[PDB]
């Protein structure tokens, strides 16, 4: 769930 | 002796680095305290000295080894040993000063730096900000060598400070954040070395505040939003623990969990 930072 | 976890930069892979970070997390936390699926580090209050530290033994392709000591209460580096010398960051208080006397007890030469290990101070000494210090397996390999050669005059202070900045991010911050672990995995996978982007820097800066906001939340809802940055530097706000469960792996103890 790293899309938060893209 | 305190628990020891080994890692080498020599032939490092995504998997070997992942195994390492997972092992570090396993020795930092007990499983007793997990909130919204996120483990909490042991409370410093009443923590017996025999449970206070873990050791990370780092080796590199140059066949050099150093051992970092991490405080279990915050996952941060407090000092290191190389051969017959050990060096400790300036302690914040008398209890911490006493605590570090229990580390590397047989070392011939013990030194405490006059400076602490916080980034603001290390960046001043390094002459560079985190945004201009490359991270990756090569940087870590180089850092281990620099730490190893400090006692004999081979390493200048700015290089020592830079080397600490590298180690702290690739070990402590990676242990604290799956996201930062992921960032280091990517660098290893592609043998790239690059400085951390704003998302990484802002997470590092916010770890304490995120820990408190999560622990003091109302059923997971933050009273006050926390501002973070995206990779391109743009700002966004976090309002709830939910979105951070995949991002933060460890929290510093701030309060008891509500009934």
Author numbering:
A (entry chain B): 110 to 115
B (entry chain A): 5 to 263
What did the study's authors say about this model?
Ricin consists of a toxic subunit, known as the A chain (RTA), and a subunit that binds galactose and N-acetylgalactosamine, known as the B chain (RTB)3. RTA has a molecular mass of 30 kDa and exhibits RNA N-glycosidase activity, which inactivates ribosomes by removing the A4324 in the sarcin-ricin loop of 28 S rRNA4. Eukaryotic ribosomal P stalk proteins have been proven to be essential for RTA binding and rRNA depurination. A distinctive feature of P stalk proteins is that they contain a highly conserved set of 11 residues (SDDDMGFGLFD) at the C-terminal tail of P2 that recruits elongation factors and interacts with several RIPs, such as trichosanthin and Shiga toxin 11415.
To promote a more efficient interaction between RTA and the synthetic C10-P2 peptide, we constructed a chimeric protein in which C10-P2 was fused to the C-terminus of RTA using four consecutive Gly-Ser (GS) repeats as a linker. Finally, we determined the structure of the RTA-C10-P2 fusion protein at a resolution of 1.5 Å. For the C10-P2 peptide, only 6 residues (GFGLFD) could be fitted to the observed electron density; these residues corresponded to Gly110-Asp115 of the human P2 protein. The 4 N-terminal residues (DDDM) were disordered and did not seem to contribute to RTA binding. As shown in Fig. 2 (A,B), the C-terminus of C10-P2 is coiled into a short helix that binds in a pocket formed by α6, α7, α8, β7 and β8 of RTA. The root mean square deviation (RMSD) of the overall main chain of the RTA moiety in RTA-C10-P2 and wild-type RTA is 0.290 Å for 222 comparable Cα atoms, indicating that the binding of C10-P2 does not substantially affect the structure of RTA. The Gly110 and Gly112 residues of P2 accommodate the required backbone dihedral angles to facilitate the insertion of Phe111, Leu113 and Phe114 into a hydrophobic pocket formed by the Tyr183, Arg235, Phe240 and Ile251 residues of RTA. The main-chain carbonyl of Phe114 in P2 forms a hydrogen bond with the main-chain amide of Arg235 in RTA, and the side-chain atom OD1 of Asp115 in P2 forms another hydrogen bond with the side-chain atom NE of Arg235 in RTA. When these 16 residues form a β-strand, the length of this strand is predicted to be 56 Å, which is much longer than 29 Å. Based on the above considerations, we believe that the linker may adopt a flexible conformation of sufficient length and thus does not disturb the interaction between the P2 peptide and RTA.
